[PDB]
Amino acid sequence: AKTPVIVVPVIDRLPSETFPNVHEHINDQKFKDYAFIQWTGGNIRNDDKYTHFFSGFCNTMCTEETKRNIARHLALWDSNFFTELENKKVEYVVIVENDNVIEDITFLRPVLKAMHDKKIDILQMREIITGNKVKTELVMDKNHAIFTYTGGYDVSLSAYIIRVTTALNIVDEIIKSGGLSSGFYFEIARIENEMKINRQILDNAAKYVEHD
Ligand SMILES: [Mg+2]
């Protein structure tokens, strides 16, 4: 059962630029270890039914820009594709916005194994909060240690690995609780905390996933 590796377009360029050293083709989708995919749903105007991701209010309304960015992900988490991955017992998906570059995907294999073994639900592959962190070793890649630290109020959806049922549970709770309103990323953090979801931040993420 292959691990989906999903490119989410946020700028206009080919998905091959995100994975410049992958020698295959990346297939589109809407509505050897890896299945490379580009997810094209969840986009702006086509969202009369993404309204349940957000509360009725906020300001006058939330900016179409902030909503659009998070909607792309929530739509993916809430897709028939994901529920089918749950049916098919696929454990994790790798999700990367296409303004990132991952030159070397070999780190993913030992990282995914270690995540499985250590019951990690989310590996966030972009850092947000600066300052000293409490690191723990995740796994050794060739001759270098890969470290993580526990996530807090530093959610980013730029690039991450997530357990399929974890993604499904989060977006379902968002829908249940009436949609996001203000402090989108804070609320995602709180939902994860309430569910005792284990989110780790990849330390020195920039080494593995270069952000544009
Ligand atoms: Mg990004």
Curated annotation (Swiss-Prot):
<keyword id="KW-0946">Virion</keyword>
<dbReference type="GO" id="GO:0046718">
    <property type="term" value="P:symbiont entry into host cell"/>
</dbReference>
<comment type="function">
    <text>Envelope protein that binds to heparan sulfate on the cell surface and might provide virion attachment to target cell.</text>
</comment>
<keyword id="KW-0472">Membrane</keyword>
<dbReference type="GO" id="GO:0016020">
    <property type="term" value="C:membrane"/>
</dbReference>
<dbReference type="GO" id="GO:0019062">
    <property type="term" value="P:virion attachment to host cell"/>
</dbReference>
<protein>
    <recommendedName>
        <fullName>Envelope protein OPG108</fullName>
    </recommendedName>
</protein>
<keyword id="KW-0735">Signal-anchor</keyword>
<keyword id="KW-1133">Transmembrane helix</keyword>
<keyword id="KW-0261">Viral envelope protein</keyword>
<keyword id="KW-0812">Transmembrane</keyword>
<keyword id="KW-1160">Virus entry into host cell</keyword>
<dbReference type="GO" id="GO:0055036">
    <property type="term" value="C:virion membrane"/>
</dbReference>
<keyword id="KW-1161">Viral attachment to host cell</keyword>
<dbReference type="GO" id="GO:0019031">
    <property type="term" value="C:viral envelope"/>
</dbReference>
<comment type="similarity">
    <text>Belongs to the orthopoxvirus OPG108 family.</text>
</comment>
<keyword id="KW-0945">Host-virus interaction</keyword>
<feature type="topological domain" description="Virion surface">
    <location>
        <begin position="1"/>
        <end position="212"/>
    </location>
</feature>
<keyword id="KW-0426">Late protein</keyword>
